C-alpha cells in the first residue's frame, strides 16, 4: 500500500516544493515520513470517532485531529 505513493508522485510533490535534483534514496524516506504523519493524525482522528460512539471517521474528526497537531486546515468544516 505504502508503495502506492509512487516515485513519480513524490517527485511531483518535491517539484511543488522547489526541488530540482533528488537523491535516489529520497523516495523511501518520504514514505517513512508520510507513514508517521498519517499514523499520528489518524490516531487522533479515530480517537475522536470512538469518543463520539460512531463507526464513521468524519471530516470534522480529521479537522479536529489536524488542529491538535497544530495543523489547522481550512476548507472542510473549520
Amino acid at each position: 500500500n505504502i508503495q502506492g505513493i509512487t516515485k513519480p508522485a513524490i517527485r511531483r510533490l518535491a517539484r511543488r516544493g522547489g526541488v530540482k535534483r533528488i537523491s535516489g534514496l529520497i523516495y523511501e524516506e518520504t514514505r517513512g515520513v508520510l507513514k508517521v504523519f498519517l499514523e499520528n493524525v489518524i490516531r487522533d482522528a479515530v480517537t475522536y470517532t470512538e469518543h463520539a460512539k460512531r463507526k464513521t471517521v468524519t471530516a470534522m474528526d480529521v479537522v479536529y485531529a489536524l488542529k491538535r497537531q497544530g495543523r489547522t486546515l481550512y476548507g472542510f468544516g473549520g
Binding site: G4, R16, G18, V19, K20, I26, I42, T56
Partner: protein, 97 residues
C-alpha cells in the same frame, strides 16, 4: 534534440507551483489511509471528505517539508536533496528528538 539535465526539472517546478491539484493518485492514497486506520480500529468507514482532508493535509505537509529539505541541501552547497537533509529539517522543526 535533448534538453540538458535540469532544464525539464526547472520547467516542472514552474508547472506545479502554478497549480493546486493534488499530486498523489486518489485511490492508492485512500488504500493507505484505511490500512493505517485498520491498525488503530477495526470495522471503520470514512466520509469521502475525511479522506480528502487527509490528502490535502498530507501533501501540504510534504510540500512544505520539501521546501525546508531543499534549503538544507543548498546550505551544504548542494542542489540534490538527500535523506540527511530531510532528517535535519525534521529535527530542527522539532518533529524528531
Amino acid at each position: 534534440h535533448r534538453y540538458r539535465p535540469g532544464t525539464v526539472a526547472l520547467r516542472e517546478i514552474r508547472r506545479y507551483q502554478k497549480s493546486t491539484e493534488l499530486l498523489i493518485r486518489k485511490l492508492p492514497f485512500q488504500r493507505l489511509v484505511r490500512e493505517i486506520a485498520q491498525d488503530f480500529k477495526t470495522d471503520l468507514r470514512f466520509q469521502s471528505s475525511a479522506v480528502m482532508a487527509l490528502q490535502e493535509a498530507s501533501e501540504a505537509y510534504l510540500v512544505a517539508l520539501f521546501e525546508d529539505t531543499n534549503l538544507c541541501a543548498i546550505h551544504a552547497k548542494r542542489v540534490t536533496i538527500m535523506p540527511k537533509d530531510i532528517q535535519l529539517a525534521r529535527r530542527i522543526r522539532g518533529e524528531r528528538a
